[PDB]
Design a protein around this ligand. Structure first.
Ligand code: JY3
Ligand code: MG
Ligand code: ZN
Length: 313
């Protein structure tokens, strides 16, 4: 009840900023998450004993893969934290509750492989879930953990509030399927520009939460350059392994997953910034003006990649 989490001064200040790095001390990450829940949602949103036991069960169900790991989960939750804190009044009590949990849970039991590889391998999950394969799995895992004894952090919610929060988390997690981002942002762009965007329209809120999820999920590109560059190494460590496994099935992977084409990384990053990242944080800034620092950091990192190609680094 009266037990607050308190970070060291440097973390207490920098955790509020969009570009915050949660650091290499894994044992501090649960406390960092709890701190963000208490300030974003309240010290009463969850029973501390249940929340702590939810967190540690979520952690256990993240694998030791180079990128799609426990650090990613907490990193994506912090970006959401920074969005919710800078947009205090735009989001309901249920939404702030559901979205930090959704981000922590969004990649549960990731194996370091794309939906496309599961399909080509003929993985059992690809039979169970024809589209957004891993994302349907991530939500399934989230429900399973919530249903463990002592793990139901939403127990104090009514039946309709419980169905509402689980529906927010499901849409939120399915939205992290990048395949769905392109159409979602296009719809949002049209709605913003024709002035039809309406935050009291539930279908519109869903779309806006969807784009927030893409923005938080890609937030590697919104860090300071050294963090962005070193996270790229972990991302490519997974992709190149997936490319190796494509070659094992007798399929040439796309250049992005082919370690033989490491040289093309800098130009690959430009395409990704221009095609995915900048449009994402631009549409997000239009809808939620105070998320401008994410767009600004994204553009700074595009500039850094342009310098790599020009042999300036
Ligand atoms: C955050 C982030 C950072 N980097 C990437 C890699 S983007 C990328 N696109 C291409 C296209 C061709 C290509 N040829 C050699 S490397 C390479 C690429 N890397 C993805 C990413 O997001 C995924 C994790 C969704
Ligand atoms: Mg994912
Ligand atoms: Zn993710």
């Amino acid at each position: 009840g009266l037990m607050q989490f308190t970070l060291p001064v440097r973390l207490c200040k920098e955790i509020e900023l969009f570009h915050f790095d949660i650091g290499p001390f894994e044992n501090m990450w649960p406390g960092i998450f709890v701190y963000m829940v208490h300030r974003s949602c309240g010290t009463s949103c969850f029973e501390l004993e249940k929340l702590c036991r939810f967190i540690m069960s979520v952690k256990k169900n993240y694998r030791r893969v180079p990128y799609h790991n426990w650090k990613h989960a907490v990193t994506v939750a912090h970006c959401m934290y920074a969005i919710l804190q800078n947009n205090h009044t735009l989001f309901t009590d249920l939404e702030r509750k559901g979205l930090l949990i959704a981000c922590l849970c969004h990649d549960l039991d990731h194996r370091g492989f794309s939906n496309s590889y599961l399909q080509k391998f003929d993985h059992p999950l690809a039979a169970l879930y024809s589209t957004s394969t891993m994302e349907q799995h991530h939500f399934s895992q989230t429900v399973s953990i919530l249903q463990l004894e002592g793990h139901n952090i939403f127990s104090t919610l009514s039946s309709s509030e419980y169905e509402q929060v689980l529906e927010i988390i499901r849409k939120a997690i399915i939205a992290t399927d990048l395949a769905l981002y392109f159409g979602n942002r296009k719809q949002l762009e049209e709605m913003y520009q024709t002035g039809s965007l309406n935050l009291n329209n539930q279908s519109h809120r869903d779309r806006v939460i969807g784009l927030m999820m893409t923005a938080c999920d890609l937030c590697s590109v919104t860090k300071l350059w050294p963090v962005t560059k070193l996270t790229a190494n972990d991302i490519y460590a997974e992709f190149w392994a997936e490319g190796d496994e494509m070659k094992k099935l007798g399929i040439q992977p796309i250049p992005m997953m082919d370690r033989d084409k490491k040289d093309e990384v800098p130009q690959g990053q430009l395409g990704f910034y221009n095609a995915v990242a900048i449009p994402c944080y631009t549409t997000l800034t239009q809808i939620l003006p105070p998320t401008e620092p994410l767009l600004k950091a994204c553009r700074d990192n595009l500039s850094q990649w342009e310098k790599v190609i020009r042999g300036e680094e």
